Design a protein around this nucleic acid. Structure first.
Lengths: 85, 82, 81, 193, 79, 67, 119, 79, 94, 162, 86, 74
RNA sequence: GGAUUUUUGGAGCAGGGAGGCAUCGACCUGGUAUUGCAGUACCUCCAGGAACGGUGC
């Protein structure tokens, strides 16, 4: 199982936790959560730090959330990048 | 690993939860179970496009949760230990 | 096996009302109720979302696509739990 | 007992339907298993069963041969019920075979006779003669020729019988001594005696 | 859960006696007593079906091991 | 478990599917997921022949025959 | 019984009068209902006494004993002993719960019943 | 009785061109030749097409693996 | 053609929609006894016709004699006993 | 043989030939329509044929009742608050009853959904202008006595009685 | 640990919120793994949950009776009133 | 081909340029790095095509399995 | 005592916008065909009418 977290597509999350790097999460709510992965699981539940939530309403909006838990079903996409840099 | 276990440790914390249907829930956790079914007390719940209502107790089916906003104080590194 | 499920099986042979996930409302005799809530019924009255009614002899609805069921009050009198 | 008919008119062969899994079922169920636990005694027979065979298509029914001159059908699902008994042989029944479609049924006994049966009534449809005791008998597998019987005889020969005529179609004399068993290596085309 | 088994019935007990003994718990829909036609007497047991399962339950609790016609009876869900 | 559908085998049926979609045809078989084989199927009308309906998307069925 | 059903649909004091006037086991349940209604005091216990006059009954009386524990004491214990069930240890459990907080010479008497043959 | 999975196995063997009804999307359907499939009804389609019922327009796809999540219905087409 | 539970009607105005035809047929024929079912199609073959099935046979005979040539939606209906027994009757009998 | 709750509870209940839920109250010799509350508003149709009812009245509020078959009774009068207890009454079959005066049919004007009306074999039928009178006073009817109410009849009924 | 969080509210009158946004108020008598619920003397509300709305408290109320709700379509529950004694 | 199944097809397509359509109509073109048992998908040098038009160049991307409509090699 | 009849779950996420367009269906006037023994998407055709009904943007 660890092997599948380590080398499979979830290695994106595994890599973000290890390097304390930022990732953008496109989300079902049409919102995007930008931050660092403290923890994750099979379902893509996550505990996130320094989250910048961004969305639109046209008007763009954002808000800072230091500490939060995301239920993984809401995940559409998870992006790793030269974002942290 | 199983992050629901982490949430199960948060009894007596106060949190804000955003629901899948947009509803916002602020209250004190009395219990999270294995299905992430969450139970609270002293709850101020604001359905999208209403003024808040206060409930002494509220019980949420786990699947209907989008995300929890945790106390800034929360010592995550402690809670992530098993 | 769940407590509500046992009570559902108890309503077999009684007149029950069923609303689907799409809000169509089916009233008639419950012939068979499966464990997963799959429902065989007969001599139905169906009331659509526009309000109109129709009549059907025989129906079978998948459990997942049921929102809820109304059972007789004859059952109410499983008080142990 | 009082079997007669079941349900609303369903035969004691036509549909397996109730049992977990599916009789129509693809040929390989899965990676196979070996059993420890025994479920049904069955009995009925006061003498050792001569033979046991399942049912054409999928194991819906099971059929047994008694040396008490008797043949019995069974659920084959561990179910208590034995369907309809058959009686009509003088001496112990040696072997049997089923109609590929599954409606007819054939038995051979040491009484020098061979009988064609209606699996749905127990009716002795036809009896085939000849002096020699008949050992293993098969029914042609091919859809085209369900009609032909192939009977192996103690007296060297194998004989094809036209079911409709009841007459001998084709004798096979090449073999020496007794014939024990006949299979079909490829349906219709060949068989190994 | 509406049908009860009732055993340990004395010879004098019949469907009328059973109706009278169990009706205090609730309405009854059926009472069956298997008979031996060679003797014309019952075999010592019967099945009593209540209209409501809750009533059948109360009957089991109060009638099991109770006395009827001088002897102890046995009462429980039939199946 | 199997769905209890043997009663409906080889009968003409009216199938309400998600998306407000409706088809009619003869039941030729099923599996534990309630996936169906429907023969002589008609989209409600245009004839589509023998088809597979995934049980997932089956809302309701109604017999057009007496069972 | 249908009149009792329509009266049940009508159903609280006057309904209790209609029920008591209507009043085998159903009358006892109606008596327990009269006790639950009257207690909503001692008069309800009197209704429990009339319910005892109606006679099951033992169970109901035992329940009533739970509602008023220090109310009658030895008299309540006598009501228990007067009942007469052939086994009926559960009553011994009731006396046991009564003694956890009661004691006295009476506790010893309760223990003595305990000596009585059963299991 | 024909089992649904087997029908598919037939579609596969036949190389009949197949038209798929998708879940909760009526304006588009998918077409192709089933080359293989799995226990989840996930399909490998060849020379596949998006079919716009509204626009009468076809989008050319080639090698497609369609998740079974989307499958409402499976039909065969002569084309 | 012997008396039958089912009556065959022809010479009916085929412009009436099928569900309306069946409902008026039911209404009209209810006066003689319970009508179990009505079979009426608009195919070329079957248009302008209907089979009305009654629980009681006496009801069918009374209907036949009393409504022969009754003006229905403009035309005089022609009634006769059906050639065969209705499937529903055969199932209800055996 | 009063129409009672007990009577209704043992009465044949079924899905009729036109696919509606119908209650069978035929041939009981009922004289007065009463106690319909016990049907619990669960029927689309109620068959009261071959009884002895005198007045079409006495109904509770029944929202699902759409068809009333009242053949071979003794109906001589129609109650005045019928729409208040039967709002969706769409079909009324009164064949072979006792309505004698055109004015006795007046209460049917208040049944807003009434579309199928049959009054055959009633003395009232032979009264001069019976058809035009019904058409003008109960315009919501589309089929009268199994014949289509046509435009020309409506106009003709507009002249007379205007 | 305790499993009680549902069992506590059993027998109580409960306000249950559905996924479409309906309000089911009934006596909470049973539940299960899926949160399929058994609700006695159950009514449905659509427009409001009253907190003493001076105009009226009740619009689009429907009496249902004995209801079994499937857990799939349940969102949440709060205590509405104490158990009826009966 | 002689039966070509979902799983092998996807495995053959690892190391290759793919495009994934999601149920929601977004499209993502990139090199398929890997897939897992649940058919979650990992792209590199991802690009986003919405309305079939290049929207955003995104880099390395995880797509949750339940979102996927279909995958195409391209 | 996490592998298909409970309790280690296959769930999940997604709806407002505006104050005409597209499709489906009865439908209403005239006139016209059809007279046949049935178990049903729907049911003649021809011309005219829709300040009709539903669904989506």
């Amino acid at each position: 199982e660890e092997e599948e977290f380590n080398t499979g597509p979830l290695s994106v999350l595994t890599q973000s936790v290890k390097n304390n790097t930022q990732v953008l999460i496109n989300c079902r709510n049409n919102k995007k959560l930008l931050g660092r992965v403290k923890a994750f699981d099979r379902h893509c539940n996550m505990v996130l730090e320094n989250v910048k939530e961004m969305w639109t309403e046209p008007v763009n909006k954002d808000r800072y959330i230091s500490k939060m838990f995301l239920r993984g079903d809401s995940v559409i996409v998870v992006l790793r990048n030269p974002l942290i840099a | 690993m199983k992050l629901v276990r982490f949430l199960m440790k948060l009894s007596h914390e106060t949190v804000t939860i955003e629901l899948k249907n947009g509803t916002q829930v602020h209250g004190t956790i009395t219990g999270v179970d294995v299905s992430m079914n969450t139970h609270l007390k002293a709850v101020k719940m604001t359905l999208k496009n209403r003024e808040p209502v206060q409930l002494e107790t509220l019980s949420i089916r786990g699947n209907n949760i989008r995300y929890f906003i945790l106390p800034d104080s929360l010592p995550l590194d402690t809670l992530l230990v098993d | 096996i769940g407590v509500p499920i046992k009570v559902l099986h108890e309503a077999e042979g009684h007149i029950v009302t069923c609303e689907t996930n799409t809000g169509e409302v089916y009233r008639g005799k419950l012939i068979e109720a499966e464990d997963n809530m799959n429902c065989q019924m007969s001599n139905i009255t169906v009331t659509y979302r526009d309000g109109r009614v129709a009549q059907l002899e025989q129906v079978y609805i998948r459990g997942s696509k049921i929102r809820f069921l109304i059972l007789p009050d004859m059952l109410k009198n499983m008080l142990k739990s | 007992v009082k079997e007669m008919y079941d349900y609303q008119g369903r035969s004691y062969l036509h549909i397996p339907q109730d049992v977990g899994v599916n009789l129509r079922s693809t040929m390989p169920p899965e990676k196979c298993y070996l059993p420890k636990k025994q479920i049904h005694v069955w009995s009925g027979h006061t003498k050792g069963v001569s033979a046991v065979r399942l049912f054409p298509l999928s194991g819906h029914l099971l059929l047994s041969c008694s040396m008490d001159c008797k043949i019995k059908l069974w659920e084959v699902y561990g179910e208590r019920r034995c369907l309809r008994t058959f009686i009509g042989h003088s001496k112990a029944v040696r072997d049997i075979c089923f109609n590929t479609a599954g409606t007819q049924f054939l038995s051979a006994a040491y009484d020098r006779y061979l009988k064609l049966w209606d699996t749905e009534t127990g009716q002795c449809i036809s009896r085939f003669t000849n002096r020699k005791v008949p050992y293993c008998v098969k029914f042609n597998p091919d859809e085209d020729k369900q009609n032909l019987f192939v009977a192996g005889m103690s007296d060297k020969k194998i004989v094809q019988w036209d079911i409709r005529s009841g007459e001998i179609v084709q004798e096979y004399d090449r073999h020496l001594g007794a014939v024990n068993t006949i299979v079909f290596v490829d349906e219709n085309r060949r068989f190994v005696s | 859960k509406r049908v009860l088994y009732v055993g340990g019935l004395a010879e004098e007990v019949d469907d009328k006696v059973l109706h009278a003994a169990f009706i205090p718990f609730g309405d009854i829909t059926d009472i069956q007593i298997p008979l031996d036609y060679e003797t014309e007497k019952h075999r010592g047991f019967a099945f009593v079906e209540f209209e409501l399962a809750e009533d059948a339950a109360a009957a089991i609790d109060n009638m099991n091991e109770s006395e009827l016609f001088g002897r102890t009876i046995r009462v429980n869900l039939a199946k | 478990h199997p769905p209890e559908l043997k009663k409906f085998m080889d009968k003409k049926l009216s199938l309400k599917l998600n998306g407000g979609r409706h088809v009619q045809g003869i039941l030729r078989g099923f599996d534990p997921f309630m996936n169906l084989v429907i023969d002589e199927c008609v989209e409600m009308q245009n004839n589509i022949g023998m088809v597979v309906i995934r049980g997932n998307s089956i809302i309701m069925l109604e017999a057009l025959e007496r069972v | 019984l249908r009149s009792h059903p329509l009266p049940e649909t009508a159903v609280f004091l006057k309904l209790s009068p209609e029920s008591a006037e209507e009043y085998y086991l159903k009358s006892s349940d109606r008596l327990d209902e009269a006790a639950q209604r009257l207690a909503t005091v001692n008069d309800e216990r009197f209704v429990s006494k009339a319910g005892k006059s109606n006679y099951h009954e033992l169970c109901d009386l035992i329940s009533q004993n739970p509602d008023k524990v220090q109310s009658l004491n030895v008299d309540a214990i006598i009501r228990g002993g007067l009942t007469r069930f052939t086994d009926q240890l559960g009553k011994l459990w009731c006396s046991l719960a009564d003694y956890y907080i009661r004691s006295g010479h009476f506790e010893k008497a309760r223990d003595v019943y305990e000596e009585a043959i059963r299991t | 009785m024909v089992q649904p999975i087997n029908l598919i196995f037939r579609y596969l063997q036949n190389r009949s061109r197949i038209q798929v009804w998708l879940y909760e999307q009526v304006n588009m359907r998918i077409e192709g030749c089933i080359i293989g499939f799995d226990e989840y009804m996930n399909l490998v389609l060849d020379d596949a097409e998006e079919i716009h019922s509204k626009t009468k327009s076809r989008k050319q796809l080639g090698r497609i693996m369609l998740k079974g999540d989307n499958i409402t219905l499976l039909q065969s087409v002569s084309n | 053609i012997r008396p039958n539970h089912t009556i065959y009607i022809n010479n009916m105005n085929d412009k009436i929609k099928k569900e309306e035809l069946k409902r008026s047929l039911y209404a009209l024929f209810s006066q003689f006894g319970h009508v179990v079912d009505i079979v009426a199609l608009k195919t070329m073959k079957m248009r302008g016709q209907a089979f009305v099935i009654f629980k009681e046979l006496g009801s069918s005979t009374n209907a036949l004699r009393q409504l022969q040539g009754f003006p229905f939606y403009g035309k005089p209906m022609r009634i006769q006993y059906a050639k065969t027994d209705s499937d529903i009757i055969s199932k209800m009998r055996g | 043989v009063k129409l009672t709750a007990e009577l209704i509870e043992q009465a044949a209940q079924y899905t009729n030939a036109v696919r509606d839920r119908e209650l069978d109250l035929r041939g009981y010799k009922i004289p007065v329509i009463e106690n319909l509350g016990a049907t619990l508003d669960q029927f689309d149709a109620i068959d009261f044929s071959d009884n002895e009812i005198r007045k079409l009245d006495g109904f509770p509020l029944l929202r699902r009742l759409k068809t009333l078959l009242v053949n071979n009774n003794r109906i001589c009068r129609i109650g005045e608050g019928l729409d208040q207890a039967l709002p969706c009454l769409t079909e009324l079959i009164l064949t072979n009853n006792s309505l004698v005066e055109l004015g006795d049919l007046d209460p049917l004007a208040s049944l807003k959904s009434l579309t199928y009306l049959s009054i055959l074999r009633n003395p009232v039928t032979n009264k001069k202008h019976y058809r035009l009178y019904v058409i003008y006073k109960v315009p919501q009817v589309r089929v009268l006595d199994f014949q289509k109410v046509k435009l020309k009849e409506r106009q003709e009924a507009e002249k007379m009685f205007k | 640990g305790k499993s009680s969080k549902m069992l506590q509210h059993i027998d109580y009158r409960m306000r249950c919120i559905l996924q479409d946004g309906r309000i089911f108020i009934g006596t909470f008598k049973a539940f299960d793994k899926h949160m399929n619920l058994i609700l006695c003397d159950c009514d449905e509300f659509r427009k409001i949950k009253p907190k003493n709305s001076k105009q009226a408290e009740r619009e689009e109320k429907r009496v249902l009776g004995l209801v079994l709700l499937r857990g799939e379509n349940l969102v949440s529950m709060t205590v509405e009133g104490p158990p009826p004694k009966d | 081909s002689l039966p070509l199944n979902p799983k092998p097809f996807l495995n053959g397509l690892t190391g290759k340029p793919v495009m994934v359509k999601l149920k929601w109509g977004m499209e993502y073109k990139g090199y398929l790095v890997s897939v897992d048992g649940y058919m979650n998908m990992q792209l590199a040098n991802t690009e986003e095509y919405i309305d079939g038009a290049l929207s955003g160049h995104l880099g390395e991307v995880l797509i949750r399995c339940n979102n996927v409509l279909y995958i195409r090699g391209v």
